[PDB]
Amino acid sequence: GESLEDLMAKMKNM
Amino acid sequence: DEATRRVVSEIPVLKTNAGPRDRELWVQRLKEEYQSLIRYVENNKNADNDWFRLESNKEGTRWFGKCWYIHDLLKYEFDIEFDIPITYPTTAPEIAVPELDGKTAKMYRGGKICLTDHFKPLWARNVPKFGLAHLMALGLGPWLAVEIPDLIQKGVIQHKEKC
């Protein structure tokens, strides 16, 4: 699926 | 059981039993945390109850954010923080709201919130299903709902933003 960096961005830009 | 499954079952359970020292297992755990936190925040936005944001250092060991409480159309904001204990996810992290330190009895030194009698046993028997989302949902949220109205009424909290 998705990397940790992806997930951190998703959380942040929400 | 009312203040239990009612609010858990909307949050997806976590799987990995690893703490911040478990290298490759910790990263897997961290990813599960982010997924669970994203899912919770989404459900919150949909129920129009978007009350918190969190973020962490790159290692996922140090968390900081903000929570929000709406009372009589006044919106209040409070900084939150916690470290992930070495024995996490067995040991629940200790959420601090530092700007309220001094103002409430349901708090330890350093602004660490004091939780209901439910929490510690309830966490302990579910390891490692509960994560940071459960900590927010069953820990900080119930705490805010009791203490913030109380401090408002007593006239001790500084409202900072026009709503």
mmCIF file of all heavy atoms in Angstrom, chain A residues 2-4 6-14, chain B residues 30-31 34 37-38 41-42 45 53-56:
data_model
loop_
_atom_site.group_PDB
_atom_site.id
_atom_site.type_symbol
_atom_site.label_atom_id
_atom_site.label_comp_id
_atom_site.label_asym_id
_atom_site.label_seq_id
_atom_site.Cartn_x
_atom_site.Cartn_y
_atom_site.Cartn_z
ATOM 1 N N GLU A 2 0.981 1.904 1.188
ATOM 2 C CA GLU A 2 1.493 3.261 1.347
ATOM 3 C C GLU A 2 2.593 3.307 2.395
ATOM 4 O O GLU A 2 2.559 2.568 3.366
ATOM 5 C CB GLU A 2 0.379 4.195 1.821
ATOM 6 C CG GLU A 2 -0.729 3.458 2.561
ATOM 7 C CD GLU A 2 -1.966 4.330 2.696
ATOM 8 O OE1 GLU A 2 -1.886 5.478 2.246
ATOM 9 O OE2 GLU A 2 -2.989 3.885 3.269
ATOM 10 N N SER A 3 3.539 4.220 2.216
ATOM 11 C CA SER A 3 4.649 4.351 3.144
ATOM 12 C C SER A 3 4.258 5.197 4.360
ATOM 13 O O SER A 3 3.229 5.883 4.384
ATOM 14 C CB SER A 3 5.851 4.945 2.465
ATOM 15 O OG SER A 3 5.602 6.291 2.075
ATOM 16 N N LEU A 4 5.136 5.182 5.359
ATOM 17 C CA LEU A 4 4.922 5.964 6.562
ATOM 18 C C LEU A 4 4.890 7.452 6.219
ATOM 19 O O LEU A 4 4.064 8.202 6.742
ATOM 20 C CB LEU A 4 6.013 5.618 7.579
ATOM 21 C CG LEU A 4 5.870 6.306 8.927
ATOM 22 C CD1 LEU A 4 4.613 5.807 9.650
ATOM 23 C CD2 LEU A 4 7.125 6.100 9.767
ATOM 24 N N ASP A 6 3.868 8.753 3.504
ATOM 25 C CA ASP A 6 2.596 9.054 2.861
ATOM 26 C C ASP A 6 1.539 9.343 3.918
ATOM 27 O O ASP A 6 0.787 10.306 3.803
ATOM 28 C CB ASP A 6 2.027 7.890 2.049
ATOM 29 C CG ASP A 6 2.729 7.622 0.731
ATOM 30 O OD1 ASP A 6 3.044 8.597 0.020
ATOM 31 O OD2 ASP A 6 2.945 6.425 0.424
ATOM 32 N N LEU A 7 1.507 8.476 4.928
ATOM 33 C CA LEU A 7 0.518 8.471 5.973
ATOM 34 C C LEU A 7 0.636 9.742 6.820
ATOM 35 O O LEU A 7 -0.378 10.350 7.144
ATOM 36 C CB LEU A 7 0.748 7.184 6.765
ATOM 37 C CG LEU A 7 0.210 5.927 6.078
ATOM 38 C CD1 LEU A 7 0.543 4.676 6.863
ATOM 39 C CD2 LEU A 7 -1.299 5.993 5.857
ATOM 40 N N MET A 8 1.871 10.153 7.134
ATOM 41 C CA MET A 8 2.149 11.378 7.852
ATOM 42 C C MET A 8 1.631 12.585 7.079
ATOM 43 O O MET A 8 1.089 13.518 7.663
ATOM 44 C CB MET A 8 3.651 11.529 8.130
ATOM 45 C CG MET A 8 4.176 10.449 9.093
ATOM 46 S SD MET A 8 5.853 10.629 9.801
ATOM 47 C CE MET A 8 5.789 12.281 10.507
ATOM 48 N N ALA A 9 1.803 12.585 5.761
ATOM 49 C CA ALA A 9 1.313 13.682 4.957
ATOM 50 C C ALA A 9 -0.216 13.707 4.979
ATOM 51 O O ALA A 9 -0.823 14.752 5.241
ATOM 52 C CB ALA A 9 1.862 13.558 3.563
ATOM 53 N N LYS A 10 -0.833 12.550 4.705
ATOM 54 C CA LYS A 10 -2.279 12.397 4.735
ATOM 55 C C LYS A 10 -2.898 12.966 6.027
ATOM 56 O O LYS A 10 -3.881 13.696 5.959
ATOM 57 C CB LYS A 10 -2.655 10.933 4.568
ATOM 58 C CG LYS A 10 -3.500 10.583 3.370
ATOM 59 C CD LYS A 10 -3.580 9.106 3.128
ATOM 60 C CE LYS A 10 -5.015 8.738 2.849
ATOM 61 N NZ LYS A 10 -5.309 7.296 2.997
ATOM 62 N N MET A 11 -2.339 12.603 7.194
ATOM 63 C CA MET A 11 -2.771 13.046 8.510
ATOM 64 C C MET A 11 -2.643 14.560 8.580
ATOM 65 O O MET A 11 -3.579 15.236 8.978
ATOM 66 C CB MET A 11 -1.900 12.415 9.604
ATOM 67 C CG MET A 11 -2.298 12.707 11.070
ATOM 68 S SD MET A 11 -3.792 11.819 11.705
ATOM 69 C CE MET A 11 -4.366 12.939 12.994
ATOM 70 N N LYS A 12 -1.502 15.080 8.129
ATOM 71 C CA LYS A 12 -1.163 16.474 8.281
ATOM 72 C C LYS A 12 -2.100 17.339 7.446
ATOM 73 O O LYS A 12 -2.571 18.347 7.943
ATOM 74 C CB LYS A 12 0.302 16.695 7.919
ATOM 75 C CG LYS A 12 0.893 17.990 8.448
ATOM 76 C CD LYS A 12 2.394 18.025 8.423
ATOM 77 C CE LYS A 12 2.984 17.192 9.538
ATOM 78 N NZ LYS A 12 4.454 17.351 9.599
ATOM 79 N N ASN A 13 -2.383 16.938 6.194
ATOM 80 C CA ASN A 13 -3.000 17.819 5.219
ATOM 81 C C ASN A 13 -4.510 17.652 5.209
ATOM 82 O O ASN A 13 -5.159 17.827 4.186
ATOM 83 C CB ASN A 13 -2.401 17.649 3.828
ATOM 84 C CG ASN A 13 -0.922 17.993 3.811
ATOM 85 O OD1 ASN A 13 -0.557 19.142 4.048
ATOM 86 N ND2 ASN A 13 -0.052 17.025 3.541
ATOM 87 N N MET A 14 -5.063 17.386 6.377
ATOM 88 C CA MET A 14 -6.424 16.942 6.539
ATOM 89 C C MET A 14 -7.140 17.928 7.481
ATOM 90 O O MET A 14 -8.375 18.032 7.573
ATOM 91 C CB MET A 14 -6.250 15.580 7.193
ATOM 92 C CG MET A 14 -7.448 14.959 7.803
ATOM 93 S SD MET A 14 -7.044 13.188 8.089
ATOM 94 C CE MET A 14 -8.641 12.496 7.654
ATOM 95 N N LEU B 30 3.514 1.868 13.801
ATOM 96 C CA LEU B 30 3.377 3.281 13.514
ATOM 97 C C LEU B 30 2.427 3.495 12.352
ATOM 98 O O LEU B 30 1.616 4.376 12.403
ATOM 99 C CB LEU B 30 4.735 3.869 13.167
ATOM 100 C CG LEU B 30 5.297 4.904 14.132
ATOM 101 C CD1 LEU B 30 6.536 5.569 13.532
ATOM 102 C CD2 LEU B 30 4.247 5.948 14.552
ATOM 103 N N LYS B 31 2.566 2.709 11.275
ATOM 104 C CA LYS B 31 1.697 2.799 10.114
ATOM 105 C C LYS B 31 0.236 2.502 10.474
ATOM 106 O O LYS B 31 -0.685 3.185 10.010
ATOM 107 C CB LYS B 31 2.168 1.804 9.049
ATOM 108 C CG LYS B 31 3.344 2.266 8.211
ATOM 109 C CD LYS B 31 3.444 1.422 6.960
ATOM 110 C CE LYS B 31 4.865 1.361 6.464
ATOM 111 N NZ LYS B 31 4.903 1.196 4.987
ATOM 112 N N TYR B 34 -1.248 5.633 12.307
ATOM 113 C CA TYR B 34 -1.606 6.652 11.330
ATOM 114 C C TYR B 34 -2.888 6.295 10.593
ATOM 115 O O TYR B 34 -3.729 7.155 10.332
ATOM 116 C CB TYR B 34 -0.461 6.947 10.370
ATOM 117 C CG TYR B 34 0.448 8.006 10.910
ATOM 118 C CD1 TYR B 34 1.571 7.693 11.655
ATOM 119 C CD2 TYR B 34 0.131 9.343 10.750
ATOM 120 C CE1 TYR B 34 2.388 8.679 12.181
ATOM 121 C CE2 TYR B 34 0.929 10.343 11.281
ATOM 122 C CZ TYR B 34 2.053 10.010 12.013
ATOM 123 O OH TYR B 34 2.817 11.008 12.560
ATOM 124 N N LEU B 37 -5.725 6.722 13.110
ATOM 125 C CA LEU B 37 -5.920 8.114 13.440
ATOM 126 C C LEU B 37 -6.617 8.832 12.270
ATOM 127 O O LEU B 37 -7.473 9.696 12.488
ATOM 128 C CB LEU B 37 -4.567 8.751 13.765
ATOM 129 C CG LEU B 37 -4.010 8.554 15.175
ATOM 130 C CD1 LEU B 37 -2.580 9.081 15.292
ATOM 131 C CD2 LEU B 37 -4.884 9.233 16.225
ATOM 132 N N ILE B 38 -6.232 8.499 11.026
ATOM 133 C CA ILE B 38 -6.835 9.096 9.841
ATOM 134 C C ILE B 38 -8.310 8.682 9.789
ATOM 135 O O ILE B 38 -9.190 9.496 9.557
ATOM 136 C CB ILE B 38 -6.060 8.763 8.542
ATOM 137 C CG1 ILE B 38 -4.731 9.522 8.455
ATOM 138 C CG2 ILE B 38 -6.925 9.058 7.336
ATOM 139 C CD1 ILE B 38 -3.661 8.844 7.557
ATOM 140 N N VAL B 41 -10.383 10.621 12.487
ATOM 141 C CA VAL B 41 -10.525 12.008 12.164
ATOM 142 C C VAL B 41 -11.568 12.175 11.061
ATOM 143 O O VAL B 41 -12.290 13.169 11.082
ATOM 144 C CB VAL B 41 -9.155 12.633 11.827
ATOM 145 C CG1 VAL B 41 -9.250 13.965 11.098
ATOM 146 C CG2 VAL B 41 -8.333 12.809 13.082
ATOM 147 N N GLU B 42 -11.643 11.226 10.116
ATOM 148 C CA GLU B 42 -12.594 11.226 9.022
ATOM 149 C C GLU B 42 -14.015 11.065 9.543
ATOM 150 O O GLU B 42 -14.911 11.804 9.153
ATOM 151 C CB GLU B 42 -12.314 10.111 8.017
ATOM 152 C CG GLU B 42 -11.283 10.464 6.978
ATOM 153 C CD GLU B 42 -10.886 9.308 6.058
ATOM 154 O OE1 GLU B 42 -11.455 8.184 6.224
ATOM 155 O OE2 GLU B 42 -9.992 9.514 5.177
ATOM 156 N N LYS B 45 -15.028 14.343 11.208
ATOM 157 C CA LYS B 45 -15.407 15.314 10.209
ATOM 158 C C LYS B 45 -16.805 15.031 9.671
ATOM 159 O O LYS B 45 -17.569 15.956 9.436
ATOM 160 C CB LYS B 45 -14.409 15.331 9.048
ATOM 161 C CG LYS B 45 -13.083 16.000 9.376
ATOM 162 C CD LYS B 45 -12.028 15.823 8.354
ATOM 163 C CE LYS B 45 -11.451 17.146 7.930
ATOM 164 N NZ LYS B 45 -10.783 16.989 6.608
ATOM 165 N N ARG B 53 -6.397 17.325 16.307
ATOM 166 C CA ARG B 53 -5.335 16.989 15.379
ATOM 167 C C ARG B 53 -4.082 16.573 16.158
ATOM 168 O O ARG B 53 -3.750 17.190 17.172
ATOM 169 C CB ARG B 53 -4.971 18.208 14.536
ATOM 170 C CG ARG B 53 -5.896 18.457 13.355
ATOM 171 C CD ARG B 53 -6.000 17.292 12.422
ATOM 172 N NE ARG B 53 -6.900 17.625 11.328
ATOM 173 C CZ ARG B 53 -8.222 17.716 11.425
ATOM 174 N NH1 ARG B 53 -8.815 17.473 12.576
ATOM 175 N NH2 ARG B 53 -8.945 17.993 10.347
ATOM 176 N N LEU B 54 -3.352 15.570 15.653
ATOM 177 C CA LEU B 54 -2.109 15.108 16.268
ATOM 178 C C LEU B 54 -1.019 15.031 15.206
ATOM 179 O O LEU B 54 -1.311 14.842 14.031
ATOM 180 C CB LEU B 54 -2.299 13.695 16.829
ATOM 181 C CG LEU B 54 -2.800 13.555 18.260
ATOM 182 C CD1 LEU B 54 -2.887 12.084 18.604
ATOM 183 C CD2 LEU B 54 -1.916 14.291 19.280
ATOM 184 N N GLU B 55 0.244 15.129 15.629
ATOM 185 C CA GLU B 55 1.344 14.768 14.744
ATOM 186 C C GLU B 55 2.538 14.343 15.608
ATOM 187 O O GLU B 55 2.454 14.492 16.824
ATOM 188 C CB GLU B 55 1.579 15.852 13.699
ATOM 189 C CG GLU B 55 2.265 17.056 14.265
ATOM 190 C CD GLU B 55 2.409 18.189 13.276
ATOM 191 O OE1 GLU B 55 1.470 18.421 12.499
ATOM 192 O OE2 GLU B 55 3.452 18.854 13.318
ATOM 193 N N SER B 56 3.583 13.764 14.990
ATOM 194 C CA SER B 56 4.695 13.147 15.714
ATOM 195 C C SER B 56 6.010 13.515 15.052
ATOM 196 O O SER B 56 6.003 14.014 13.938
ATOM 197 C CB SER B 56 4.579 11.662 15.822
ATOM 198 O OG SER B 56 4.662 11.041 14.546
#
